[PDB]
Amino acid sequence: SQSNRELVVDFLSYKLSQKGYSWSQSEAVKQALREAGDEFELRYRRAFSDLTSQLHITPGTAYQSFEQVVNELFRDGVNWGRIVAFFSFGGALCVESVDKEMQVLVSRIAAWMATYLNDHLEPWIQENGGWDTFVELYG
Ligand SMILES: CCCCc1c(-c2ccc(C(=O)NS(=O)(=O)CC[Si](C)(C)C)cc2C(=O)N2CCc3ccccc3C2)c(CO)nn1-c1ccccc1
DSSP states (O other): OOHHHHHHHHHHHHHHHHTTOOOOOOHHHHHHHHHHHHHHHHHTHHHHHHHHHHHOOOTTTHHHHHHHHHHHHTTTOOOHHHHHHHHHHHHHHHHHHHHTTOTTHHHHHHHHHHHHIIIIIHHHHHHTTHHHHHHHHHO
16 A cells, blocks of 8 residues: 555545545645646546547556556656646546446556556656645645
């Protein structure tokens, strides 16, 4: 149970409840990410909703859709905004999965997110002041 895993789970659990799904499977960091994710989704509502709906999620295409969006997202480098988009995207992927009755994808998307965070985002996060800097700038 890594810190990145706990962050992904708090974000996804929040997002699923915000979208009508009751449960399940720092607090300052978590609250900041919840708010930044809400702000991102409201800022790009229509285009964000079109992106996720247009993917047409299936247990077999979910990973490639995730990989393709994430890869394109961090093409020109990492920044706090794109990290917010990544959590938001993953969040939209989980709700979409529960909406379409493919709830088996929820913990799968959680793993792919925790893995991508640990492997390709943790260094940059540390080099750009850690999560405490994110709470200051976005929370
Ligand atoms: C899940 C959404 C990913 C969005 C994204 C960004 C990006 C990421 C962040 C932002 C952004 O606004 N960052 S910010 O720092 O200004 C956020 C500030 Si808030 C106070 C709202 C957290 C905009 C952009 C961006 O280029 N956008 C805005 C978001 C959006 C949503 C749906 C479709 C297109 C766009 C265009 C990029 C560029 O890397 N590529 N992509 C992308 C990748 C694959 C397919 C389609 C689009």
